């Protein structure tokens, strides 16, 4: 989607403590949004373990079943490294895989 949070007011920069201001929220139709407003001095003390969208895609990429940036030793190695299985009626089929994780590089 595309959730954006911005100021509703266009003037009165640095408002007074306790002042009413308008929070403007643009986002996808039908979505439910959760909020929290934190002093930044908490984050100056401890900014670890903050969740973000980039870490979400990082967790998904760590859950990927493909292990190689393409190609392969043969047609079977192409599918097996990509994360696919193939089996034909003539007999040609992919290599057997019994491990969930990717093989580790020599490094």
């Amino acid at each position: 989607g595309s959730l954006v949070v911005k100021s509703g007011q266009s003037e009165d920069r640095q408002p007074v403590p306790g002042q009413q201001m308008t929070l403007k929220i643009e986002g996808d139709h039908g979505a439910r949004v959760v909020l929290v407003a934190v002093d930044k001095g908490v984050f100056v003390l401890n900014k670890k373990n903050k969740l973000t969208q980039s870490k979400i895609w990082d967790v998904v990429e760590k859950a990927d079943i493909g292990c190689t940036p393409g190609s392969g030793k043969d047609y079977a190695g192409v599918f097996s490294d990509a994360g696919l299985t193939f089996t034909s009626s003539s007999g040609q089929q992919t290599a057997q895989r019994a491990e969930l994780q990717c093989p580790q590089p020599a490094a």
Binding site: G18, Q19, Q20
Partner: protein, 84 residues
């Protein structure tokens, strides 16, 4: 009689504007009593600014406190309409 000279009518006009808001200050200071603590904080700070400005007759303070007390009055009126 001789008509009022220059600034005397202008300063009286500013004092009449400030006197009008102070008549309903006790109503407005009351009206924040059923509202949030921000309004009650703001009006009692803004109230003395108007009260001193009228009796001191300083032009600078009477100008500022007029528009300051008008601003919190608009906030109270919008509060009372939104609170229902």
């Amino acid at each position: 009689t001789s008509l009022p000279t220059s600034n005397e009518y202008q300063n009286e006009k500013l004092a009449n504007e400030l006197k009008s808001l102070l008549d309903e200050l006790n109503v407005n200071e009351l009206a924040t009593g059923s509202l949030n603590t921000y309004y009650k904080r703001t009006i009692k700070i803004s109230g003395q600014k108007a009260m001193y400005a009228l009796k001191s007759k300083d032009f600078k303070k009477m100008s500022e406190a007029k528009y300051q007390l008008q601003k919190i009055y608009n906030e109270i009126d919008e509060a009372l309409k939104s609170k229902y």
